[PDB]
Amino acid sequence: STTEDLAKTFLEKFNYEAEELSYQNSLASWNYNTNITDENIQKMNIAGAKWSAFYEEESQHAKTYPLEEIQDPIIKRQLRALQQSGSSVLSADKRERLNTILNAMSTIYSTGKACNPNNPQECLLLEPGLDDIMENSKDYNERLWAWEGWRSEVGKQLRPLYEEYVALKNEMARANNYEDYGDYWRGDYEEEWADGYNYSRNQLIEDVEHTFTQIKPLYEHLHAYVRAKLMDAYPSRISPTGCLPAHLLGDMWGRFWTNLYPLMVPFGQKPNIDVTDAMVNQSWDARRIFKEAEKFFVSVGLPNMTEGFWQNSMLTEPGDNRKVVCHPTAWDLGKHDFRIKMCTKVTMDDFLTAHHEMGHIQYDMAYAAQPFLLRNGANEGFHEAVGEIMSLSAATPNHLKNIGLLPPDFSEDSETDINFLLKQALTIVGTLPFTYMLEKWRWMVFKGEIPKEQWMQKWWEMKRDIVGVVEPLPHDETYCDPAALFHVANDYSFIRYYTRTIYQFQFQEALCQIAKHEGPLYKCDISNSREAGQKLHEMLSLGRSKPWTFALERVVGAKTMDVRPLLNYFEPLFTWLKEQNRNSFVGWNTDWSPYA
Amino acid sequence: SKVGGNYNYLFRLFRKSNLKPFERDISTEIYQAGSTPCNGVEGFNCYFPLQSYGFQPTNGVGYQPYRVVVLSFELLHAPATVCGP
């Protein structure tokens, strides 16, 4: 037999072995988050170690099989999926440096807590007091205590090994067998390939610039709203045109801008549609809500849940004595037993995001016939993008009246709807910038281009006038602004958010262009319309028979970003914005030295 | 579908030629296809011909087992064995 043929025999066996042990680890995770005891923890650890050992001996096998006399494309795809291998040779010293440093910060982050500089009596962990403040409290000494205490308490326990780890970051991001670890944080998307569809980080960064130049102003006004509610809650500090002093940040590092929502009112009558008391009063029944999920996909042909689905699929938190995290994690147990692990209650999350969960199930069945290497979502970016679509489309009185529960002459209140558009724009465009800054630095240090001296001067002179950051106390060169985050220690690459954002952004262009909107991207609805039903649902459901580029293009159009529907948001929100709060403006910052 | 699961169904993996209807082969020698003869060393294209099923109680709609029964007939001038009311 050829190398291809012997490896194909070994393939015919390890497919079955992999499905079996993957399902076993799937029930292992099921018992992980359905009940928690020490024996359970040890059991999940041993099962994971066992399957990892199987994968590692498979890896050593894969190193043996050559590839040069192989001439089969799809068979070669499966062969490469088989032949991914490595990392069983590092010496004690260097392996200790890298992995021990990472795991050490992981463990201290898990097992750390803080206290107060001025009144150390009311001192508490990371979760209760600090998140209590950012969710409910509006006191200046409270927020200031939060930030200063956390900094002067956690940096002191993280910094020295992390400066030696500035050096270690340099060395291991250069050495770890690949091009660089900036592009390995971009590495599941890292490309050195062929076959016609070369789009990459060059176009990525260039459309970053062009995205600013076209659709930045709504993010401008959104920043105005959040930062202004804070500045009103603590009035009389700042000049308008420039940036803000930061002893009033509002969160830890600025992951989201969602942390700063309510009070400011240039968008200011009543808040977005909230239906707690509406569900209390009229109670459009949730069983019929899942029935309209069924119906609005039975105009396209999709089934419901089963008794086994009721038994297994768990959507909320356990809420009992069980010590589990309420982090919602999209799940599937395999073997067509698509179940879920969220923290989902009867809310807008239920209706829309559970259209999206039941669509996890339906989508799994949509790719249930895939071969071994393709049983997963075509993209996790699809999940979030179409979840936004589903929320903003099925959260609709027109759907609710098409099922016949609301009248069709609804009038709305301008300022309130305007708040809702505020928040939506906030998320959509406020994703990128600070993470862009740190990713520029990380790219070229993980490639080794920053010398060991210009870090912090670069940070400030990229903190007031180029594109926008803010941070109060001076993080001098000893501290590691390059990396000080548990999620960086946890390899959760954020910027993939923005990558799928632009992808899905022009994907929405092409898709609802085929759907033929009159203007913007919302109201791209489906309910009780058979022709639109096929023309978007058979549209969205294709499969994975070809490479990723071919799949995404054939499915959903072009490889760029929107301006037409965001522009048909802008100009109408420009006119409305006029008629209430006509005094919008421009600016983004990054070139500072504020407190010094 | 028992709670622990059932791992007691198995099929063939390797062969040289195609069979004929109503035919059966039972050889279970170490399968070799390398020019270097396989003395009986596991690995290097020498494996165990059978492969189990691995069934479980909570399998999916497409994977839940079904009991197949075939009632075949032979249609010739042979003596008949069919009756009715």
Curated annotation (Swiss-Prot), chain B:
Result for mutant: residue 51 to R: In strain: Omicron/BA.1, Omicron/BA.2, Omicron/BA.2.12.1
Phenotypic consequence of residue 10 to R: Increased resistance to neutralizing antibodies. Decreases HLA binding to NF9 epitope. Increased binding affinity to human ACE2
Effect ascribed to mutating residue 63 to H: In strain: Omicron/BA.1, Omicron/BA.2, Omicron/BA.2.12.1, Omicron/BA.2.75, Omicron/BA.4, Omicron/BA.5, Omicron/BQ.1.1, Omicron/XBB.1.5, Omicron/EG.5.1
Cysteine pairs bridged by disulfides in the record: 38-46
Effect of residue 2 to T: In strain: Omicron/BQ.1.1
Annotated stretches, region: Disordered: 13-48
Phenotype upon changing residue 48 to L: Increased resistance to neutralizing antibodies and human covalescent sera neutralization
Phenotype upon changing residue 77 to P: Increased resistance to human covalescent sera neutralization
Effect on the protein of changing residue 41 to A: Increased resistance to neutralizing antibodies
Region (Receptor-binding motif): 1-66
Region (Immunodominant HLA epitope recognized by the CD8+): 6-14
Outcome (variant: residue 4 to S): In strain: Omicron/BA.1, Omicron/BA.2.75, Omicron/XBB.1.5, Omicron/EG.5.1
Function, as annotated: Attaches the virion to the cell membrane by interacting with host receptor, initiating the infection. The major receptor is host ACE2. When S2/S2' has been cleaved, binding to the receptor triggers direct fusion at the cell membrane. When S2/S2' has not been cleaved, binding to the receptor results in internalization of the virus by endocytosis using host TFRC and GRM2 and leading to fusion of the virion membrane with the host endosomal membrane. Alternatively, may use NRP1/NRP2 and integrin as entry receptors.
UniProt subunit comment: Binds to host ACE2. RBD also interacts with the N-linked glycan on 'Asn-90' of ACE2. Cleavage of S generates a polybasic C-terminal sequence on S1 that binds to host Neuropilin-1 (NRP1) and Neuropilin-2 (NRP2) receptors. Interacts with host integrin alpha-5/beta-1 (ITGA5:ITGB1) and with ACE2 in complex with integrin alpha-5/beta-1 (ITGA5:ITGB1). May interact via cytoplasmic c-terminus with M protein. May interact (via N-terminus) with host bilirubin and biliverdin, thereby preventing antibody binding to the SARS-CoV-2 spike NTD via an allosteric mechanism.
Protein name according to UniProt: Spike protein S1
Natural source organism: Severe acute respiratory syndrome coronavirus 2 (2019-nCoV)
